[PDB]
Design a protein around this ligand. Structure first.
Ligand SMILES: [Zn+2]
Length: 834
DNA sequence: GTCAGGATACTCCTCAATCTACCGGCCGA
DNA sequence: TCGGCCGGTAGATTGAGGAGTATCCTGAC
């Protein structure tokens, strides 16, 4: 023992005398009893009595009925106390091997709580009653009973479950959720008393009240919500959803009161928007984070050079105040000694338990970098995760054995550990790699792929359990099982497949390959359940073939896409004139729900005001990331530079940009003829009045640029300069000059669909040659802004599109430098052949 | 001796967006 | 042999947000 241990036992004076006298036989009856466990047991309210009970009982308690090891006994004595140990001794054979049928783990979980003897006797006397009359799962009863004051929770559940289920319409799962917390009797009683008042007077959804009251001290949160809903909604302009999001956390009453007190201070003296404040306060212990922000925002923003956004990001997590003080204390030493940039420190500190991650990084960066050969970036990657302290310690402990005995490489171990719960995945790999690679015929790279994702331990265990079942009974392949399991929540996907594969392949006429394809993404359980529920509805009520539904579902958010298609098929098919194929194509992408909703919102605006044919909007949305693309296009079009609108509308495709040189009548007539030819090619009539108006605007404004979109409307750009834009490395701009002097704008991309076979399709020279062929132009000259010169393919395939006898002169920019063996930096003429 | 409220820290799942490697029919110099 | 200022397909990161589990603490009887 050390002086710190004696200080620890100083809380219980009788334990200090007991330990110093009977230490010889405590370790004798309890092998592998460390000093920390002893000081933890002895410093409780009954430390001496608990140690005496452990000495007396642990010798025989390890029998067949319980077979509890020394760790379980120490945990019971530390948490339950001497009374819990005595109760367990008195009821060794009553709890297990009886109609109760409780495994030793459940008994240990129930007993190792404050006042756990009462919980043990109460679960003993109510388990048959709760299981028979009220139809409660024994696991649920054990979950309710394993809480501080769990006897009161059990009694209140027995008294009030029928009332809550009948007179208030709550499922038994919800009541079990409410009553599985400390002081659950108070939460149940307050829910029963205040459910109507909150649901009708304050307009609260019953599930919202349940979410509020399913936390520790939920009675206080409910009463505080009732008290402070009008104040925060009216005097501070907070939507009720924000208030119920604040209050749905442990200590939500304190968070609500602190918000009500400090919102004006944090909003009129620190420059924080209310959204930032309610994001800070929407986490466990949000009052502490709010107060620490109010105290340390100037210090961390003026001396340590952190933006307020970084401070809000650090403080928007569980234990945010601990992270804020740790950042203040450790930023100079983590930056001026260990070499981390402040962004990396902020990234490490921006997760739950960020204080532990930062302290562990400061402690273990040199040893992990030197003894194990890890890069600092790898250590930061491991640490920038929830529970990163545990992952770093596990990496330090298990890198040699995993790299040497199991044949893994450090990169594989780091990849496994760089995830939430990476310690569990590492331990599970180190335990299960031989049996998986020997009995089930897997390979180490497959095991690493399975274990890399979050919940890799659960996926590994589920694979080790279900691979023979799925491969023999259901006729799958080990590769298909590995593909299903190599995703986030792969255990749920594996179980859902093992349940629904015969049903899906028999009732709905699907294919095992189709099921494996749907199940091989994140939320594959959700996608499988949605497919099983909605395949008939989509097939008859909307006329969608099963292949289309499988194509929609085989995406990361497939459930959301399927529900969005169900909701939005008729309105988009009728109110917007979209074929079902277009909606299916839009939704058959990651984030297809967002694309569908964005199309719903922004189809009329782009179609009527701007000049976008529905085909262009569908094509933009039919790609991945459809919402950001549509939003960016709308933002550029509604308010942006004239040039930027020019490139956006050119890249949309199908547009013709024409600029005149002189106000002579002949050039105006030629431009009108070209516009008419393009419009007839697009199949839209320009009408005489619009032709007269555009001729007037062309003859009255010199240097104006006209843009004819496929929709029909003509955009006018009066000032977009007389020179080619500087090359941006992504898009090339070209100007075609004819004999008279008119200039035609071209942009790389959007090639001719019937010439996809050509490797020069979509290039500026190819587009110019196609334009010359379509408009019957004898000769022309192209100026492009690309500094890499003409493409290699366009050097030989250009004189294949333009008609024979036509001369096209390509002129690269003066400062062009060829980057390839086939590019050209000099002016070149092209004459076509047959 | 038991109970309640709060407080952190860690683990597993679902969804969205972006990035990257890949292929492919058609040409003369 | 050797050249894509293109576009589709498929996979592989990146990031966020939301739940669920777990241990601890103080104050009050
Ligand atoms: Zn080219």
């Amino acid at each position: 023992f050390t002086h710190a241990h004696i200080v620890a036992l100083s809380q219980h004076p009788a334990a200090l005398g007991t330990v110093a006298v009977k230490y010889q036989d405590m370790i004798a009856a309890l092998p592998e009893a460390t000093h920390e466990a002893i000081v933890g047991v002895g410093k409780q309210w009954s430390g001496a009595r608990a140690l005496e009970a452990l000495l007396t009982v642990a010798g025989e308690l390890r029998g067949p009925p319980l077979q509890l090891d020394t760790g379980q006994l120490l945990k019971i004595a530390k948490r339950g106390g001497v009374t819990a140990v005595e109760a367990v001794h008195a009821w060794r054979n009553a709890l297990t091997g009886a109609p109760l049928n409780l495994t030793p783990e459940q008994v240990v979980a129930i007993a190792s709580h404050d006042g756990g003897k009462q919980a043990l006797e109460t679960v003993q006397r109510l388990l048959p009653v709760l299981c028979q009359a009220h139809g409660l799962t024994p696991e649920q009863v054990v979950a309710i009973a394993s809480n501080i004051g769990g006897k009161q929770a059990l009694e209140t559940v027995q008294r009030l479950l029928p009332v809550l289920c009948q007179a208030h319409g709550l499922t038994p799962e919800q009541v079990v959720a409410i009553a599985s917390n400390n002081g659950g009797k108070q939460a149940l009683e307050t829910v029963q008393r205040l459910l109507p008042v909150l649901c009708q007077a304050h307009g609260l959804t019953p599930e919202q009240v349940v979410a509020i009251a399913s936390n520790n001290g939920g009675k206080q949160a409910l009463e505080t919500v009732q008290r402070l809903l009008p104040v925060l909604c009216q005097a501070h302009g907070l939507t009720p959803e924000q208030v119920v999001a604040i209050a749905s956390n442990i200590g939500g009453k304190q968070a609500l009161e602190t918000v009500q007190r400090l919102l004006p201070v944090l909003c009129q003296a620190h420059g924080l928007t209310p959204e930032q404040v309610v994001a800070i306060a929407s986490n466990g212990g949000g009052k502490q984070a709010l107060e620490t922000v109010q105290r340390l925002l100037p210090v961390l923003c003026q001396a340590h050079g952190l933006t307020p956004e970084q401070v809000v990001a650090i403080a928007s997590n569980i234990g945010g105040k601990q992270a804020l003080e740790t950042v203040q204390r450790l930023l100079p030493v983590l930056c001026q000694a260990h070499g981390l940039t402040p962004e990396q420190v902020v990234a490490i500190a921006s997760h739950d338990g960020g204080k532990q991650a930062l302290e562990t990084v400061q402690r273990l960066l040199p040893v992990l970098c030197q003894a194990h050969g890890l890069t600092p970036e790898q250590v930061v990657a491991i640490a920038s995760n929830g529970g990163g302290k545990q992952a770093l310690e596990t990496v330090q402990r298990l890198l040699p054995v995993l790299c040497q005995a199991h044949g893994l490489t450090p990169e594989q171990v780091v990849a496994i550990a760089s995830h939430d719960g990476g310690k569990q995945a590492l331990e599970t790999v180190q335990r299960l790699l031989p049996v998986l690679c020997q009995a089930h015929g897997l390979t180490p790279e497959q095991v690493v792929a399975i274990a890399s994702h979050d919940g890799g331990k659960q996926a590994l265990e589920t694979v080790q359990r279900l691979l023979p079942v799925l491969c023999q009974a259901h006729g799958l392949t080990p590769e298909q099982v590995v593909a299903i399991a190599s995703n986030g929540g792969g255990k749920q996907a594996l179980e859902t497949v093992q349940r629904l594969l015969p049903v899906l392949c028999q009732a709905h006429g699907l294919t095992p390959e189709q099921v494996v394809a749907i199940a091989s993404h994140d939320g594959g359980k959700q996608a499988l359940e949605t497919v099983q529920r909605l395949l008939p509805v989509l097939c008859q009520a909307h006329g969608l073939t099963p292949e289309q539904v499988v194509a929609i579902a085989s995406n990361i958010g497939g459930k959301q896409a399927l529900e969005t298609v169900q909701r939005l098929l008729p309105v988009l098919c009728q109110a917007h004139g979209l074929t079902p194929e277009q909606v299916v194509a839009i939704a058959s992408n990651i984030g297809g729900k967002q694309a569908l909703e964005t199309v719903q919102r922004l189809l009329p605006v782009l179609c009527q005001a701007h000049g976008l044919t529905p085909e262009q909007v569908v094509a933009i949305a039919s790609n991945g990331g459809g919402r950001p693309a549509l939003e960016a296009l709308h933002a550029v079009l509604t308010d942006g530079p004239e040039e930027a609108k020019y490139e956006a509308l050119m890249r949309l495709g199908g547009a013709l940009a024409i600029r005149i040189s002189d106000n002579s009548e002949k050039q105006i007539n030629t431009a009108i003829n070209l516009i008419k030819n393009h419009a007839k090619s697009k199949g839209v009539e320009l009408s005489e009045e619009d032709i007269k108006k555009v001729e007037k605007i062309l003859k009255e404004n010199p240097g104006v640029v006209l843009l004819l979109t496929p929709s029909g409307k003509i955009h006018v750009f009066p000032s977009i300069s007389w020179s080619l834009p500087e090359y941006d490395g992504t898009t090339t701009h070209g100007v075609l000059v004819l004999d008279d002097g008119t200039q035609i704008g071209f942009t790389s991309g959007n090639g001719d669909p019937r010439y996809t076979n050509y490797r020069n399709n979509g290039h500026v020279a190819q587009k110019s040659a196609l334009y010359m062929r379509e408009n019957n132009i004898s000769n022309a000259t192209v100026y492009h802004n690309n500094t890499n010169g003409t493409c290699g393919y366009c050097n030989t395939m250009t004189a294949t599109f333009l008609p024979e006898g036509a001369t096209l002169t390509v002129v690269p920019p003066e400062n062009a430098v060829a980057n390839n063996s086939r590019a050209i930096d000099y002016v070149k003429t092209y004459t076509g052949t047959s």
